[PDB]
Coordinates of C-alpha atoms and ligand atoms in Angstrom, one line a residue:
Chain Q
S1 CA 9.2 -14.3 1.8
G2 CA 6.7 -12.1 3.7
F3 CA 3.5 -11.1 2.5
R4 CA 2.0 -7.6 1.9
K5 CA -1.0 -5.6 0.8
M6 CA 1.1 -4.2 -2.4
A7 CA -0.1 -1.6 -4.4
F8 CA 1.0 -1.2 -8.0
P9 CA 3.7 1.3 -8.6
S10 CA 1.6 4.6 -8.8
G11 CA 4.2 6.8 -11.2
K12 CA 2.0 6.1 -14.0
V13 CA -1.0 7.3 -12.5
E14 CA 0.8 10.5 -11.0
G15 CA 1.7 11.8 -14.3
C16 CA -2.2 12.0 -15.0
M17 CA -3.7 13.6 -12.2
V18 CA -4.8 17.2 -12.5
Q19 CA -7.1 19.3 -10.3
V20 CA -10.4 20.3 -12.2
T21 CA -12.5 23.6 -10.4
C22 CA -15.6 24.4 -11.6
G23 CA -16.8 27.3 -9.8
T24 CA -16.1 26.9 -6.2
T25 CA -16.0 23.1 -6.0
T26 CA -12.6 21.7 -6.6
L27 CA -11.8 17.8 -7.4
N28 CA -9.3 15.5 -9.3
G29 CA -9.3 14.9 -13.0
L30 CA -7.4 12.1 -14.7
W31 CA -5.6 13.6 -17.9
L32 CA -5.2 11.0 -20.9
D33 CA -4.3 12.1 -24.1
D34 CA -6.2 15.2 -24.8
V35 CA -9.2 14.3 -22.4
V36 CA -9.6 15.0 -18.5
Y37 CA -12.0 12.6 -16.8
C38 CA -13.4 13.7 -13.5
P39 CA -17.0 13.3 -11.5
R40 CA -19.5 15.2 -13.1
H41 CA -20.6 16.4 -9.6
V42 CA -17.7 19.4 -10.1
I43 CA -20.6 21.4 -11.7
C44 CA -22.4 21.0 -8.3
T45 CA -22.5 23.1 -5.5
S46 CA -23.3 21.9 -1.8
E47 CA -27.0 22.7 -2.3
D48 CA -27.3 21.0 -5.8
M49 CA -26.2 17.7 -4.5
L50 CA -29.3 17.1 -2.6
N51 CA -31.1 16.6 -6.0
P52 CA -29.1 17.5 -8.8
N53 CA -30.2 17.6 -12.7
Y54 CA -26.9 17.5 -14.4
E55 CA -27.8 18.0 -17.6
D56 CA -29.6 21.1 -16.6
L57 CA -26.7 22.3 -14.4
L58 CA -24.3 21.4 -17.5
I59 CA -26.2 23.8 -19.6
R60 CA -25.0 26.7 -17.3
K61 CA -21.4 25.7 -17.8
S62 CA -19.2 26.6 -20.8
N63 CA -15.7 25.3 -21.5
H64 CA -14.1 28.6 -19.8
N65 CA -15.7 27.8 -16.3
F66 CA -13.8 24.3 -16.0
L67 CA -10.3 25.0 -14.6
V68 CA -7.8 22.4 -15.3
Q69 CA -4.3 22.3 -13.6
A70 CA -1.6 20.0 -14.1
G71 CA 0.8 20.7 -11.6
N72 CA 1.0 24.3 -11.8
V73 CA 0.4 24.7 -15.4
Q74 CA -3.3 25.7 -16.6
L75 CA -4.9 23.3 -19.6
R76 CA -7.0 25.0 -22.1
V77 CA -10.6 23.3 -22.4
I78 CA -11.8 23.1 -25.7
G79 CA -14.7 20.9 -25.3
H80 CA -16.7 19.4 -22.6
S81 CA -19.6 16.3 -22.6
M82 CA -21.1 14.6 -20.0
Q83 CA -20.7 10.5 -20.2
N84 CA -23.0 9.1 -17.3
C85 CA -21.5 10.4 -14.1
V86 CA -18.0 11.6 -15.6
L87 CA -17.2 14.7 -17.5
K88 CA -14.6 14.6 -20.2
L89 CA -12.9 18.0 -20.5
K90 CA -11.1 17.9 -24.2
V91 CA -8.0 20.1 -23.6
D92 CA -5.7 21.3 -26.6
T93 CA -2.6 19.3 -25.2
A94 CA -2.1 15.8 -25.1
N95 CA -0.9 14.7 -21.7
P96 CA 3.2 14.0 -22.5
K97 CA 3.0 11.6 -19.4
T98 CA 0.0 9.6 -20.7
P99 CA 0.9 5.6 -20.1
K100 CA -0.3 2.7 -22.2
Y101 CA -4.0 2.7 -21.0
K102 CA -7.3 0.8 -21.1
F103 CA -10.6 1.5 -19.3
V104 CA -11.9 -1.6 -17.6
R105 CA -15.1 -2.5 -15.3
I106 CA -14.2 -4.7 -12.9
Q107 CA -15.9 -7.4 -11.4
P108 CA -16.6 -7.5 -7.5
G109 CA -14.0 -9.6 -5.6
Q110 CA -11.3 -8.1 -8.3
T111 CA -8.5 -5.7 -6.5
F112 CA -7.1 -2.4 -7.4
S113 CA -4.8 0.1 -6.4
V114 CA -6.1 3.6 -5.5
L115 CA -4.2 6.9 -5.7
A116 CA -5.8 9.1 -3.2
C117 CA -5.4 12.7 -4.5
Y118 CA -6.3 16.2 -3.2
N119 CA -6.4 19.3 -5.3
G120 CA -4.7 17.0 -8.3
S121 CA -1.7 15.9 -6.0
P122 CA -1.4 12.5 -4.8
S123 CA -0.9 11.9 -0.9
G124 CA -0.8 8.1 -1.1
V125 CA -1.5 4.7 -2.7
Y126 CA -3.3 1.6 -1.3
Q127 CA -4.6 -1.7 -2.4
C128 CA -8.6 -1.9 -2.2
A129 CA -11.0 -4.6 -3.5
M130 CA -14.5 -4.2 -5.1
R131 CA -16.8 -5.6 -2.5
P132 CA -19.7 -7.7 -3.7
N133 CA -21.7 -5.0 -2.5
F134 CA -20.0 -3.0 -5.3
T135 CA -18.4 -0.5 -2.6
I136 CA -14.9 0.2 -1.8
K137 CA -13.6 0.3 1.7
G138 CA -11.3 3.1 0.9
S139 CA -9.6 6.1 3.0
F140 CA -10.8 9.2 1.2
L141 CA -11.7 12.7 2.4
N142 CA -13.6 15.6 0.9
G143 CA -11.5 17.0 -2.3
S144 CA -10.3 13.0 -2.9
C145 CA -13.1 12.7 -5.8
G146 CA -11.7 12.1 -9.0
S147 CA -9.0 9.9 -7.5
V148 CA -8.6 6.6 -9.5
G149 CA -8.5 3.1 -9.2
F150 CA -6.3 0.9 -11.5
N151 CA -4.1 -2.2 -12.3
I152 CA -0.9 -2.4 -14.1
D153 CA -0.2 -5.2 -16.7
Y154 CA 3.8 -4.5 -17.4
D155 CA 3.5 -1.0 -19.1
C156 CA -0.3 -0.8 -19.5
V157 CA -2.7 1.1 -17.0
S158 CA -6.1 -0.6 -16.7
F159 CA -8.0 2.5 -14.9
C160 CA -11.1 0.5 -13.3
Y161 CA -12.4 3.3 -10.7
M162 CA -12.8 6.5 -10.2
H163 CA -14.1 7.9 -6.6
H164 CA -17.3 10.0 -6.5
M165 CA -19.1 9.4 -3.1
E166 CA -18.7 8.7 0.7
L167 CA -21.8 6.6 1.8
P168 CA -23.2 7.8 5.2
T169 CA -21.6 4.5 6.4
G170 CA -17.9 5.7 5.6
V171 CA -17.4 3.2 2.7
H172 CA -17.0 4.5 -0.7
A173 CA -19.2 4.3 -4.3
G174 CA -17.4 5.4 -7.4
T175 CA -17.6 4.8 -11.4
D176 CA -15.5 3.1 -14.1
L177 CA -14.1 5.4 -16.3
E178 CA -17.1 5.7 -18.4
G179 CA -19.0 7.2 -15.7
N180 CA -21.1 4.1 -15.0
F181 CA -21.3 3.8 -11.1
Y182 CA -20.3 0.3 -9.5
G183 CA -23.5 -1.0 -7.7
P184 CA -27.0 0.9 -7.5
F185 CA -25.4 4.1 -6.2
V186 CA -26.0 7.6 -7.6
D187 CA -24.2 10.7 -7.6
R188 CA -26.5 12.6 -5.2
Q189 CA -26.3 13.6 -1.4
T190 CA -29.1 11.3 -0.4
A191 CA -28.9 8.0 2.0
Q192 CA -28.0 5.0 0.0
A193 CA -27.3 2.2 1.7
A194 CA -25.1 -0.7 0.9
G195 CA -26.1 -4.4 0.6
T196 CA -24.3 -7.4 2.6
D197 CA -20.9 -7.3 2.4
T198 CA -20.2 -10.9 1.8
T199 CA -16.5 -12.1 1.9
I200 CA -14.7 -12.9 -1.5
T201 CA -14.4 -16.4 -0.6
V202 CA -11.8 -17.0 -3.5
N203 CA -9.4 -14.2 -2.5
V204 CA -9.5 -15.8 1.2
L205 CA -8.5 -19.4 -0.3
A206 CA -5.9 -17.2 -2.6
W207 CA -4.3 -15.6 0.6
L208 CA -4.3 -19.1 2.4
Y209 CA -2.4 -20.7 -0.2
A210 CA -0.1 -17.6 0.2
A211 CA 0.3 -18.1 3.7
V212 CA 1.3 -21.7 3.0
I213 CA 4.1 -20.5 0.6
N214 CA 5.3 -18.1 3.1
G215 CA 5.5 -20.6 6.0
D216 CA 2.3 -20.0 7.9
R217 CA 0.4 -23.6 7.7
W218 CA -0.9 -24.2 11.5
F219 CA -4.3 -24.0 9.7
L220 CA -3.7 -26.9 7.6
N221 CA -6.0 -29.7 8.5
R222 CA -6.3 -33.3 7.9
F223 CA -10.1 -32.9 6.0
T224 CA -11.2 -32.3 3.0
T225 CA -14.8 -31.2 1.6
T226 CA -16.7 -31.0 -1.4
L227 CA -18.0 -27.5 -3.4
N228 CA -21.6 -28.0 -2.0
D229 CA -20.6 -28.8 1.3
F230 CA -18.2 -25.9 1.9
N231 CA -21.0 -23.4 0.1
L232 CA -23.2 -24.6 3.4
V233 CA -20.6 -23.3 5.5
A234 CA -19.8 -20.1 3.1
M235 CA -23.2 -19.2 3.3
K236 CA -23.9 -19.2 6.9
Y237 CA -20.5 -17.3 7.3
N238 CA -22.0 -14.6 4.5
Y239 CA -19.0 -15.7 2.0
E240 CA -19.3 -15.7 -1.4
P241 CA -20.3 -19.3 -3.1
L242 CA -17.4 -20.7 -4.3
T243 CA -17.9 -22.0 -7.9
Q244 CA -15.6 -24.2 -10.2
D245 CA -14.5 -21.2 -12.3
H246 CA -13.0 -20.0 -8.5
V247 CA -11.5 -23.5 -8.3
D248 CA -10.1 -23.1 -11.6
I249 CA -8.3 -19.9 -11.1
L250 CA -6.7 -21.4 -7.8
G251 CA -5.4 -24.2 -9.9
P252 CA -1.8 -22.5 -10.0
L253 CA -1.8 -21.9 -6.4
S254 CA -2.8 -25.6 -5.7
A255 CA -0.4 -26.7 -8.0
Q256 CA 2.4 -24.8 -6.6
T257 CA 1.5 -25.7 -3.0
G258 CA 0.4 -29.4 -3.8
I259 CA -2.9 -28.4 -1.6
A260 CA -6.0 -29.4 -3.3
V261 CA -8.6 -26.6 -3.6
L262 CA -11.0 -28.4 -2.0
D263 CA -8.6 -29.4 0.9
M264 CA -8.0 -25.7 1.2
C265 CA -11.8 -25.1 1.5
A266 CA -11.8 -27.7 4.5
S267 CA -9.1 -25.7 6.1
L268 CA -11.1 -22.2 5.5
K269 CA -14.4 -24.2 6.8
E270 CA -12.7 -25.3 10.1
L271 CA -11.7 -21.6 10.4
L272 CA -14.8 -20.1 9.9
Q273 CA -16.2 -22.7 12.5
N274 CA -13.7 -22.4 15.0
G275 CA -11.9 -18.9 14.5
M276 CA -8.4 -18.4 14.7
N277 CA -8.0 -19.2 18.3
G278 CA -6.0 -16.3 18.9
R279 CA -3.5 -17.0 16.6
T280 CA -2.3 -15.1 13.1
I281 CA -2.0 -15.9 9.6
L282 CA 0.6 -13.6 7.6
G283 CA 0.2 -11.3 10.5
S284 CA -3.5 -11.0 10.2
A285 CA -5.9 -11.9 12.9
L286 CA -8.6 -12.6 10.2
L287 CA -9.4 -13.7 7.1
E288 CA -8.2 -11.4 4.6
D289 CA -10.2 -11.1 1.5
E290 CA -8.5 -8.3 -0.8
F291 CA -6.0 -10.4 -2.6
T292 CA -7.3 -12.3 -5.8
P293 CA -5.8 -15.6 -6.9
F294 CA -3.6 -13.5 -9.7
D295 CA -2.4 -11.0 -7.1
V296 CA -0.9 -13.9 -4.7
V297 CA 1.1 -15.3 -8.1
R298 CA 2.1 -12.0 -9.0
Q299 CA 3.7 -11.2 -5.4
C300 CA 4.7 -14.6 -4.9
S301 CA 6.8 -14.6 -8.2
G302 CA 7.9 -10.8 -8.6
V303 CA 6.2 -9.8 -11.5
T304 CA 7.0 -6.2 -12.4
Chain E
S1 CA -13.3 8.5 6.4
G2 CA -11.7 4.8 6.2
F3 CA -8.2 4.0 7.5
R4 CA -5.7 2.4 4.9
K5 CA -2.3 1.4 5.2
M6 CA -1.3 3.9 2.6
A7 CA 2.1 4.1 0.9
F8 CA 3.6 7.2 -0.5
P9 CA 2.8 7.6 -4.3
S10 CA 6.0 6.2 -5.6
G11 CA 6.4 7.9 -8.9
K12 CA 9.4 10.1 -7.8
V13 CA 11.2 6.7 -6.6
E14 CA 10.2 4.7 -10.1
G15 CA 12.4 7.3 -11.9
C16 CA 15.4 6.3 -9.7
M17 CA 15.3 2.5 -10.1
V18 CA 18.1 0.8 -12.3
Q19 CA 19.1 -2.5 -12.6
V20 CA 23.0 -3.2 -11.5
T21 CA 24.7 -6.4 -12.5
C22 CA 28.0 -7.6 -11.5
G23 CA 29.0 -11.0 -13.1
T24 CA 25.9 -13.2 -12.6
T25 CA 24.2 -11.2 -9.7
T26 CA 21.6 -8.7 -10.7
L27 CA 19.9 -6.3 -8.3
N28 CA 18.2 -3.0 -8.1
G29 CA 20.0 0.3 -7.7
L30 CA 19.1 4.0 -6.8
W31 CA 20.2 6.2 -9.4
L32 CA 20.3 9.7 -8.1
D33 CA 22.1 12.7 -9.5
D34 CA 25.4 10.8 -11.1
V35 CA 25.5 8.2 -8.6
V36 CA 24.0 4.7 -8.3
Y37 CA 23.4 3.1 -4.9
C38 CA 23.3 -0.6 -4.6
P39 CA 24.3 -3.5 -2.1
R40 CA 27.8 -4.3 -2.1
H41 CA 26.7 -7.9 -2.1
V42 CA 26.3 -7.4 -6.2
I43 CA 29.8 -8.6 -6.5
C44 CA 29.2 -11.7 -4.6
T45 CA 28.6 -14.9 -6.1
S46 CA 26.6 -17.4 -3.9
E47 CA 29.7 -19.1 -2.6
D48 CA 31.5 -15.8 -1.7
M49 CA 28.1 -14.7 0.6
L50 CA 29.0 -17.7 3.0
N51 CA 32.0 -15.7 4.3
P52 CA 32.8 -12.3 2.1
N53 CA 35.5 -10.3 2.3
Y54 CA 34.1 -7.4 0.3
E55 CA 37.5 -5.1 0.3
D56 CA 39.3 -8.4 -1.6
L57 CA 36.3 -9.0 -3.6
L58 CA 36.2 -5.2 -4.8
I59 CA 39.7 -5.2 -5.8
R60 CA 38.9 -7.7 -8.7
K61 CA 36.3 -5.3 -9.9
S62 CA 36.5 -2.5 -12.3
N63 CA 34.2 0.2 -13.4
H64 CA 33.3 -1.9 -16.7
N65 CA 32.5 -4.9 -14.5
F66 CA 29.2 -2.7 -13.1
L67 CA 26.3 -2.8 -15.6
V68 CA 23.9 -0.3 -14.8
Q69 CA 20.7 -0.3 -17.1
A70 CA 18.1 2.4 -16.7
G71 CA 14.8 1.3 -18.5
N72 CA 16.8 -0.2 -21.4
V73 CA 19.7 2.3 -21.5
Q74 CA 23.1 1.7 -20.4
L75 CA 24.6 4.1 -18.0
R76 CA 28.5 4.4 -18.2
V77 CA 30.1 3.9 -15.0
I78 CA 32.9 6.3 -14.3
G79 CA 33.6 5.4 -10.9
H80 CA 33.2 2.9 -8.0
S81 CA 33.4 3.1 -4.2
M82 CA 32.2 1.1 -1.0
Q83 CA 30.7 3.0 1.6
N84 CA 29.9 0.7 4.4
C85 CA 27.5 -2.1 2.7
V86 CA 26.6 -0.2 -0.4
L87 CA 28.3 0.6 -3.8
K88 CA 28.4 4.0 -5.2
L89 CA 28.6 3.7 -8.7
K90 CA 29.6 6.9 -10.3
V91 CA 28.1 7.4 -14.0
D92 CA 28.5 9.9 -16.5
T93 CA 24.9 11.1 -16.6
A94 CA 23.0 12.9 -13.9
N95 CA 19.4 10.9 -13.7
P96 CA 17.0 13.6 -15.3
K97 CA 14.4 12.2 -13.1
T98 CA 16.2 12.7 -9.7
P99 CA 13.7 14.1 -7.6
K100 CA 14.6 16.5 -4.6
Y101 CA 16.1 14.2 -2.0
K102 CA 17.7 13.3 1.5
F103 CA 19.3 10.4 3.0
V104 CA 17.6 10.0 6.5
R105 CA 18.7 7.4 8.8
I106 CA 15.2 6.5 10.6
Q107 CA 14.6 5.5 14.3
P108 CA 12.6 1.9 15.0
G109 CA 9.0 2.8 15.1
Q110 CA 9.1 4.9 12.1
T111 CA 7.4 3.8 9.0
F112 CA 8.1 4.2 5.4
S113 CA 7.3 3.3 2.0
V114 CA 8.8 0.4 0.1
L115 CA 9.1 0.3 -3.9
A116 CA 9.9 -3.4 -4.5
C117 CA 11.6 -3.8 -7.5
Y118 CA 13.2 -6.9 -9.7
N119 CA 15.8 -6.2 -12.0
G120 CA 15.5 -2.5 -11.7
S121 CA 11.7 -2.5 -12.2
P122 CA 9.2 -1.6 -10.0
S123 CA 6.4 -4.5 -8.9
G124 CA 4.7 -2.8 -5.9
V125 CA 4.7 -0.7 -3.3
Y126 CA 3.7 -1.0 0.3
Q127 CA 3.9 0.6 3.8
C128 CA 6.3 -0.9 6.5
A129 CA 7.8 0.0 9.7
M130 CA 11.4 -0.2 11.2
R131 CA 10.8 -2.7 14.0
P132 CA 12.2 -2.2 17.4
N133 CA 14.5 -4.7 16.7
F134 CA 15.6 -3.2 13.6
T135 CA 14.1 -5.9 10.8
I136 CA 11.2 -4.7 8.4
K137 CA 8.4 -7.4 7.8
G138 CA 8.5 -6.9 4.0
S139 CA 7.6 -8.8 0.8
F140 CA 10.6 -9.6 -0.8
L141 CA 12.0 -12.4 -3.2
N142 CA 15.4 -12.7 -4.6
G143 CA 16.4 -10.1 -7.0
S144 CA 14.8 -7.2 -4.7
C145 CA 17.9 -6.4 -3.1
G146 CA 18.4 -2.5 -3.8
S147 CA 14.8 -2.1 -3.4
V148 CA 14.4 1.2 -1.4
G149 CA 12.4 2.5 1.5
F150 CA 11.1 6.1 1.4
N151 CA 9.1 8.8 2.9
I152 CA 7.9 12.2 1.1
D153 CA 7.6 15.7 2.1
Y154 CA 5.8 17.4 -0.5
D155 CA 8.5 17.2 -3.3
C156 CA 11.3 15.9 -1.3
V157 CA 12.1 12.1 -1.1
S158 CA 13.7 11.1 2.2
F159 CA 15.3 7.9 1.5
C160 CA 15.7 5.6 4.4
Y161 CA 16.0 2.1 3.5
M162 CA 17.8 -0.3 1.3
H163 CA 16.8 -4.0 1.0
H164 CA 19.8 -6.1 1.7
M165 CA 18.9 -9.5 3.1
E166 CA 16.2 -11.8 4.2
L167 CA 17.1 -13.4 7.3
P168 CA 16.2 -17.0 7.8
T169 CA 12.9 -16.1 9.7
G170 CA 11.5 -14.6 6.6
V171 CA 12.0 -10.9 8.0
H172 CA 14.1 -8.2 6.2
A173 CA 17.2 -6.8 7.2
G174 CA 18.9 -3.6 5.2
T175 CA 20.7 -0.6 5.3
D176 CA 20.2 3.4 5.4
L177 CA 21.5 4.8 2.1
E178 CA 24.9 5.3 3.6
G179 CA 25.3 1.7 3.5
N180 CA 24.8 1.0 7.8
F181 CA 22.5 -1.9 8.6
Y182 CA 19.8 -1.1 10.7
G183 CA 20.3 -3.3 13.8
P184 CA 23.1 -5.7 14.4
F185 CA 22.9 -7.5 11.0
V186 CA 25.7 -7.9 8.9
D187 CA 25.6 -8.7 4.7
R188 CA 26.6 -12.4 5.0
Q189 CA 24.8 -15.5 4.5
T190 CA 25.0 -16.4 8.0
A191 CA 22.0 -17.3 10.6
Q192 CA 21.4 -13.9 12.1
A193 CA 18.6 -14.1 14.5
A194 CA 16.6 -11.1 15.2
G195 CA 15.5 -9.8 18.5
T196 CA 12.1 -9.5 20.4
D197 CA 10.0 -7.7 18.3
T198 CA 8.1 -5.4 20.8
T199 CA 4.9 -3.6 19.6
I200 CA 5.5 0.1 19.0
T201 CA 3.4 1.3 21.7
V202 CA 3.0 5.2 20.4
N203 CA 1.7 3.7 17.0
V204 CA -0.9 1.5 18.4
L205 CA -2.0 4.6 20.2
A206 CA -1.9 7.0 16.8
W207 CA -4.1 4.0 15.3
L208 CA -6.4 4.2 18.0
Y209 CA -7.0 7.7 17.6
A210 CA -7.5 7.1 14.0
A211 CA -9.9 4.4 15.1
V212 CA -12.1 7.1 17.1
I213 CA -11.6 9.7 14.3
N214 CA -13.1 7.3 11.8
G215 CA -15.9 6.0 13.8
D216 CA -14.6 2.9 15.6
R217 CA -15.1 3.8 19.3
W218 CA -16.2 0.5 21.1
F219 CA -12.8 0.1 22.8
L220 CA -13.3 3.4 24.5
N221 CA -13.7 2.9 28.2
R222 CA -14.5 4.8 31.4
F223 CA -10.6 4.6 32.6
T224 CA -7.5 6.2 32.6
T225 CA -4.0 5.3 33.9
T226 CA -0.6 6.7 34.6
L227 CA 2.6 6.3 32.4
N228 CA 4.3 3.9 35.1
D229 CA 0.8 2.0 35.1
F230 CA 0.5 1.2 31.8
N231 CA 4.3 0.6 31.2
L232 CA 3.8 -2.2 33.5
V233 CA 1.3 -3.5 31.0
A234 CA 3.3 -2.8 28.1
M235 CA 6.2 -4.3 29.5
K236 CA 3.9 -7.8 30.4
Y237 CA 2.8 -7.6 26.5
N238 CA 6.0 -6.8 25.1
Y239 CA 4.9 -3.1 24.1
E240 CA 7.5 -0.5 23.6
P241 CA 7.7 1.7 27.2
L242 CA 5.5 4.8 26.5
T243 CA 7.9 8.2 27.4
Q244 CA 6.5 11.7 27.6
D245 CA 8.0 11.9 24.2
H246 CA 5.5 9.7 22.7
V247 CA 2.4 11.4 25.0
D248 CA 3.7 14.7 23.4
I249 CA 3.6 13.3 19.7
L250 CA 0.5 12.3 20.2
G251 CA -1.1 15.4 21.5
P252 CA -2.3 16.7 18.2
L253 CA -4.5 13.4 18.0
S254 CA -5.7 13.7 21.7
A255 CA -6.7 17.6 20.8
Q256 CA -8.4 16.5 17.9
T257 CA -10.2 13.6 19.5
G258 CA -10.6 15.3 23.1
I259 CA -9.3 12.1 24.4
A260 CA -6.8 12.4 27.0
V261 CA -3.3 10.5 25.7
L262 CA -3.5 8.5 29.4
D263 CA -7.4 7.8 28.7
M264 CA -6.3 6.1 25.3
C265 CA -3.5 4.5 27.2
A266 CA -6.4 2.9 29.5
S267 CA -8.5 1.6 26.4
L268 CA -5.3 0.1 25.1
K269 CA -4.5 -1.5 28.4
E270 CA -7.8 -3.1 28.5
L271 CA -7.4 -4.3 24.9
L272 CA -4.1 -5.6 26.1
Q273 CA -5.6 -7.3 28.9
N274 CA -8.9 -8.7 27.6
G275 CA -8.2 -9.1 23.8
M276 CA -10.9 -7.7 21.2
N277 CA -13.4 -10.2 22.0
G278 CA -13.9 -11.1 18.4
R279 CA -14.3 -7.5 17.5
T280 CA -12.3 -5.3 14.9
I281 CA -11.2 -1.8 14.9
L282 CA -10.4 -0.3 11.4
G283 CA -10.9 -3.6 9.9
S284 CA -8.3 -5.3 11.7
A285 CA -8.6 -8.3 14.5
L286 CA -5.5 -7.1 15.9
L287 CA -3.4 -3.8 17.4
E288 CA -2.0 -2.5 14.4
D289 CA 1.4 -0.7 15.2
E290 CA 2.8 0.6 11.6
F291 CA 0.9 3.8 11.6
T292 CA 2.7 6.4 13.3
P293 CA 1.2 9.5 15.0
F294 CA 2.4 11.6 12.0
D295 CA 0.7 9.0 9.6
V296 CA -2.6 9.2 11.1
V297 CA -2.4 13.1 11.1
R298 CA -1.3 13.1 7.2
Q299 CA -4.2 10.5 6.3
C300 CA -6.5 12.2 8.3
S301 CA -6.2 15.3 6.9
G302 CA -4.9 14.8 3.4
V303 CA -1.6 16.0 3.1
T304 CA -0.1 15.7 -0.5
Ligands
LRC401 C1 -16.8 13.8 1.7 C2 -16.4 13.0 1.1 C3 -15.5 12.1 2.0 C4 -15.0 10.8 0.8 N1 -15.0 10.7 -0.5 C5 -15.9 11.6 -1.0 C6 -16.4 12.6 -0.4 N2 -17.4 13.4 -1.0 C7 -18.6 13.2 -1.1 O1 -19.1 12.0 -1.0 C8 -19.4 14.5 -1.9 C9 -20.7 13.9 -2.8 C10 -21.8 14.0 -1.8 N3 -23.0 13.4 -2.5 C11 -23.2 12.6 -3.8 C12 -21.6 12.6 -4.3 CL1 -21.4 11.9 -6.1 C13 -20.3 13.1 -3.9
LRC402 C1 16.7 -14.3 -1.2 C2 15.9 -13.0 -1.1 C3 14.7 -12.9 -0.3 C4 14.2 -11.6 0.0 N1 15.1 -10.6 0.3 C5 16.5 -10.8 -0.2 C6 16.8 -12.3 -0.6 N2 18.3 -12.2 -0.8 C7 19.6 -12.6 0.1 O1 18.8 -12.3 1.5 C8 20.7 -12.6 -0.3 C9 21.5 -12.4 0.7 C10 22.4 -13.3 1.5 N3 23.0 -13.2 2.6 C11 23.4 -12.1 2.7 C12 22.9 -10.8 2.1 CL1 23.3 -9.2 2.4 C13 22.0 -11.3 0.9

């Protein structure tokens, strides 16, 4: 029992973290096989960031200008290319610590662990969710760029995120490992406002099932609702509309607890309309939306 | 910016996790140098747990009865001894992945990361605090015993906790790495109620400073208080009494923000008396007490 915002064990990612320096800018890189992945803004100076022409900037850069350091050993850069907003630095040595890996572009609402790094060194790990507005509410400071988001399935690390930017609102924007930003963000020091941050309804329901499994049941009511009735409430409270796909993925939680998905929706409806009335659910005084139904199942069963 | 419940990167601990089987009981072990540390209840059967005589049970156990598996390779057990509530299994091979380490007995209020494991395999990592009543509000299921709590200072892992037990209230009790339980708990399947879980006042203040640093300032008021006046409020709200030692450790946060510790105490006093009035602080609708002043400094500066 107990329910925690659990991150994946970061070991497999730690062995991939390197430091990339280009000129006077130092950020993190991800070394997998003989390639180092890093945000292309490593080639920029603070002045360049206002309106960078990355292709023009990359012309003035040679393989020797990219300093890649793994722990304390230097990697020899034998190739460089730009793929969208990431630089792929071909090095002469395959990372001996490269885990089994995939590059995945996650959907909004999906969660992942972040291994926050500075100068190629890991400082901490935390669980995040790709917000519906394609930002992540992370914890990053200057130098954290290049830190990656990932998920792990047994021995395979699915890298899904690379941190690039902090928006003026303190929220974070980044790319998948092909260098494509999540959301409409560009890697430019320009004000880019994020869209409405809606609540990930399916995740809140998944977390409500986790609460029932772990003992917190006060919020269960004598009511039920329909997907349409629930969505009227979800729209008013800036919750993502619930679909039959969401109901389907909540099926294993509904089966374990014996609480129909629409019955749980009615509990969520009442929680939205009446608040928590000073009470808590899994030690939280608000509705947690950064646990997917898969995370709840995984944590509640002990998947390693 | 952004503030997260960050755990230490778990890599150094992952390379120490092994599976220990004694008879039909399998739990986690911590392999450092040529020793494997695990809860002594690994020698128990479910019947034995009701009233175990560990010395009598250990007599019937030989080195060959302890099966220690690291990943998929078997460790040869050349010695066994019981130190308080832990078993130290001397193996013939030093763990090649043993990081620099220390065994530390933490104080209540101090935080640590937990690498939850099942059958010697890590499932996740999360940040915890040793509650003032010496329990931890973790996330553990059957088979998680032997999972360890730790802190990391650059390259040195300070192991502070080993999970042993789940109390009937769903909270967790365990030992330091010398096998001494935190709190009055015994490794017996008997109802052991925990004491009052008070709030770690110094940590809530540290988290309030983290909120100010990151932009959440709505709770700052035009008031101040004294340690004695604050403690009258802290006692009523089952908060730990604040001492001058606590004020001293909040000094670097007070200096960075320019908000005197007693002024922050007055904001906390008002938050206790009036609640949050539907608002949030660092995305939380309650006062977070599982970030020490050291954690706030570390996260807010980027210590790797
Ligand atoms: C200072 C900081 C804090 C947290 N996370 C990231 C950063 N860094 C930046 O945002 C720098 C930057 C500026 N303009 C466009 C890009 Cl691509 C990157
Ligand atoms: C089932 C579970 C869930 C989470 N954490 C731990 C456990 N296991 C136990 O508590 C088993 C146990 C019983 N009596 C005394 C001891 Cl030392 C250990």
